[PDB]
């Protein structure tokens, strides 16, 4: 039971513990979620490259968010910064030492952070350099926002009819969206948690106007809230979720507008891989019903820079690099040599 009296430094961006964790999730992903076709840039010999195709069996099993504890090896120990309000990088005041890390749920999603650690105090936003707009901003929420995304089942048709000269119920065509899904969240809870983001954002950037806009563009994985549950890759449009201007709105009483907001989602087969640069192809959606529920414990944002003034600082949903997903959980951790 030692007590060293020293100024303990801490960081989460230049942390090896995060990059090491990443390697293990990918390994767990390759033995759980396998694509039927994989396309990878065969970059051999500096000169411009070609594509590498590989076809393999793809079982539709579910990738369960099995709790992960990064424990300390013999001869090593991990420090847990127990500061009530930590900024991410810098000197930590109160820090204890546990042997294993808290239960981290391996969730690979963009824009929004689901099933994670909640802040026991207040909302804490952090970035490597807030003055720089290229750096992503990780937001931690203290109030759990439950999101429920689902998709119908086989209840379409229920009976067939045999006939010596014909059959019934087998001509299902109607070129439409059978790979469509939708989510649901509390309008009152989302707007309130959206406000607390602004409250803390203006605490770092005051005399400015915080505006929330959709994704500026890019791969569908970033533009839409992408996640996977049951074996299907969802792509929900987060346009309505992040669409509100804040520069003069601080009250709170009771106002109704649109029962519960619903997100336009779509299940896809061709996916852009997050592990390595490339694409992937999966099997068609499962026949049964897909129901998923999770708590939005945080989110990722990327503000618009530019030396050009307007008085408004726009904040669009970032995300993409899965290193930040585990960084939101391993921010208060640093592996150390037992010396």
């Amino acid at each position, epitope marked *: 039971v030692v007590l060293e009296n020293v100024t303990e430094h801490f960081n989460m961006w230049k942390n090896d513990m995060v990059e090491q964790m990443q390697e293990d999730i990918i390994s767990l992903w390759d033995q759980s979620l396998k694509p*039927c*076709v994989k*396309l990878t840039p065969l970059c051999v010999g500096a000169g411009s490259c070609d594509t590498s*195709v590989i*076809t393999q069996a793809c079982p539709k099993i579910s990738f369960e968010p099995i709790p992960i504890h990064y424990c300390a090896p013999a001869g090593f120990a991990i420090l847990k910064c127990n500061d009530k309000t930590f900024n991410g990088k810098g000197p930590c005041k109160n820090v204890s030492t546990v042997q294993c890390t808290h239960g981290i749920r391996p969730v690979v999603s963009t824009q929004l952070l689901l099933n994670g650690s909640l802040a026991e105090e207040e909302v804490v936003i952090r970035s490597d350099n807030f003055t720089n707009n290229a750096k992503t901003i990780i937001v931690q929420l203290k109030e759990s926002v439950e999101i429920n995304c689902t998709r119908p089942n086989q209840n379409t048709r229920k009976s067939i009819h045999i006939g010596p000269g*014909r*059959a019934f119920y087998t*001509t299902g*065509e109607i*070129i439409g969206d059978i*790979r469509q899904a939708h989510c649901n969240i509390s309008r009152a809870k989302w707007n309130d948690t959206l406000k607390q983001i602004v409250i803390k954002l203006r605490e770092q950037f005051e005399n400015k106007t915080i505006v929330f806009n959709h994704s500026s563009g890019g791969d*569908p994985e970033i533009v839409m809230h992408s996640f996977n549950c049951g074996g299907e890759f969802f792509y929900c449009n987060s346009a309505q979720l992040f669409n509100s201007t804040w520069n003069n709105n601080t009250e709170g009483s009771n106002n109704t507008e649109g029962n519960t907001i619903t997100l336009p989602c*779509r299940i*896809k*087969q*061709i996916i852009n891989m997050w592990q390595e640069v490339g*694409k992937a*192809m999966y*099997a*068609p959606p499962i026949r049964g019903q897909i129901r998923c529920s999770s708590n939005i414990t945080g989110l990722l944002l990327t503000r618009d820079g530019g030396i050009n003034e307007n008085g408004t600082e726009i904040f669009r949903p970032g995300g993409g690099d899965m290193r930040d997903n585990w960084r939101s959980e391993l921010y208060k951790y640093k592996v150390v040599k037992i010396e």
Partner: antibody, heavy 130, light 109 residues
Framework: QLLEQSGAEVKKPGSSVQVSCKAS????????FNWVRQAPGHGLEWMGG????????NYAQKFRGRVTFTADQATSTAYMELTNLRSDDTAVYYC????????????????????????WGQGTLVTVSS | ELVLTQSPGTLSLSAGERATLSCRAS???????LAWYQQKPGQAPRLLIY???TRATGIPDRFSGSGSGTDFTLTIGRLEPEDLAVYYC?????????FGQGTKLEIKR
């Protein structure tokens, strides 16, 4: 010179005929395999296809309960069987390989492929006579 | 059910000049997906142009396509004695995938 079919033959009315399509060029699994027959002098008529890697198959309404698209990935050969042959079934059946998944814009690949076919087979003429 | 008709039925033109073909549709094609095919005498069909505009690999700059909804046209450039073939148009926006009636392109000499 890479996608070849079987040999032409004659089949008495009422019997079933099976046409193979040996795909020996590159990939067979992910690409869909449709079948479009063509009567002598007439136009092309699409029958249906199959995606080997998924086992999915989409066919035309005109051939209900008559076509059975199967694929053997071991020999990389696509099959097609048509039951209850009649005088109108006499045609040169073509085996066309679907274009494939649209990687840089499309987000799905179901049924029997994208829709159009780039690589085509030699075509086999099945004559229906007694 | 979506049926397609091709005009004209038969076209006999000389070499060097351009040729014009048309594909009329019964309904509006989904997502605007149309395919053109070239079939020489006693041979197998060849993909000419897909997506109504995009050109298939190997196909010369002479062949060009343009169309919208029901009005679809394929324009053959500098004609050649080898270009003699029956042409077909196939839609792939809605099942069943239907082909056109066909246009016999003969060559004048």
């Amino acid at each position: 010179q890479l996608l070849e079919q079987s040999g032409a033959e004659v089949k008495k009315p009422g019997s079933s005929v099976q046409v193979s399509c040996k795909a020996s060029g590159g990939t067979f699994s992910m690409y869909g395999f449709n079948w479009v027959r063509q009567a002598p002098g007439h136009g092309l008529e699409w029958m249906g296809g199959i995606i080997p890697i998924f086992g999915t198959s989409n066919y035309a309404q005109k051939f209900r309960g008559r076509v059975t698209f199967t694929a053997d990935q071991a020999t990389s050969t696509a099959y097609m069987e048509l039951t209850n042959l009649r005088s109108d079934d006499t045609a040169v059946y073509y085996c066309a390989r679907d274009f494939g998944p649209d990687w840089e814009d499309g987000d799905s690949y179901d049924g029997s492929g994208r829709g159009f076919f780039d690589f085509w087979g030699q075509g086999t003429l099945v004559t229906v006579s007694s | 059910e979506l049926v397609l008709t091709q005009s004209p039925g038969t076209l006999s033109l000389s070499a060097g000049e351009r040729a014009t073909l048309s594909c009329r549709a019964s309904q509006s094609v989904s997502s605007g997906s149309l395919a053109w095919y070239q079939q020489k005498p006693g041979q197998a069909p060849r993909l000419l142009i897909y997506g109504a505009s995009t050109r298939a690999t190997g196909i010369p700059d002479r062949f060009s396509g343009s169309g919208s909804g029901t009005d679809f046209t394929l324009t053959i450039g500098r004609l050649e004695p080898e270009d003699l073939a029956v042409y077909y148009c196939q839609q792939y926006g809605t099942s069943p995938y239907t082909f056109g009636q066909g246009t016999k392109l003969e060559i004048k000499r």
